[PDB]
Amino acid sequence: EHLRYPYLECIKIGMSRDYLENCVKVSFPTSQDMFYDAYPSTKTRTKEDFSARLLAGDYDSLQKLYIDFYLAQTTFDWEIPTRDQIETLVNYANEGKLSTALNQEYITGRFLTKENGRYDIVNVGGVPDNTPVKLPAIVSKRGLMGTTSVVNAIPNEIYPHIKVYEGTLSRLKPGGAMIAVLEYDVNELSKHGYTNLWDVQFKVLVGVPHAETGVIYDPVYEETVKPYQPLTGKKLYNVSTNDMHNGYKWSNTMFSNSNYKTQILLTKGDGSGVKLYSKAYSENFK
Helix, strand or coil: CCCCCCHHHHHHCCCCHHHHHHHHCECCCCCCCHHHHHCCCCCCCCHHHHHHHHHCCCHHHHHHHCHHHCCCCCCCCEECCCHHHHHHHHHHHHCCCCCHHHHHHCCCEEEEEEECCEEEEEEECCCCCCCCEECCCCEECCCCCCCCCCCCEEECCECCCCCCCCCCCCECCCCCCCEEEEEEEHHHHHHCCCCCCCCCEEEEEEECCCCCCCCCCCCCEEEEECCCCCCCCEEEEEEECCCCCCCCCCHHHHCCCCCCEEEEEEECCCCCCCCEECCCECHHHC
């Protein structure tokens, strides 16, 4: 660590002085050699070994051998980016705010992400599913601001096949509250990390669904709901909105605009886990 580290290095590999605040926020490129200077003579940590582990999908080993021990550029909270942070990185890259290699490597591709404890792949530029996974850099958990809007970095969203029972039961109409009786497979829940059927929660989203994924990423009205659910290899939940003791804010929102839709989301009790979505429904669940 000479006297000008790490800012000299960042400038050398193309970071602009106009955006030099990013030098401690985003790591040196993992496709190049300088990054590996952080690890002492073995060399057992290399450009080549890193790439190989990433290819093989051994993400846990990258975390444990590389990420946990990077600890360089004056920062300690290095992590695999979130989807939100990748959205920032793509914009930064398009605008030339990173190092040269990273300005190029975040333009399109499939990117490894980590949100809490789970690994996901996110797609930038509608690229084919056999494009190699990328981890061009690690980032400051606290230092790199995530971007909330979903424009460039498109998640692979899961829609569990579910039945709404209808008739006298469930109701999605103007003039009152929304009632729904969802029904999920045990085998489909087990495939996405849901073994304990009791540990679940629901979110009711209202607005214009994203044109690619079908998710309402920025709803005009959100609501959290606790279910009161409890046949043959399947499980049921009963999700209802509160409009009798929470004001008619839902109907007045849903039916203020003809393009507006209502969507139902299942998560783990604490908001984590693989996000399970319903269709974004029209009036009467159309």
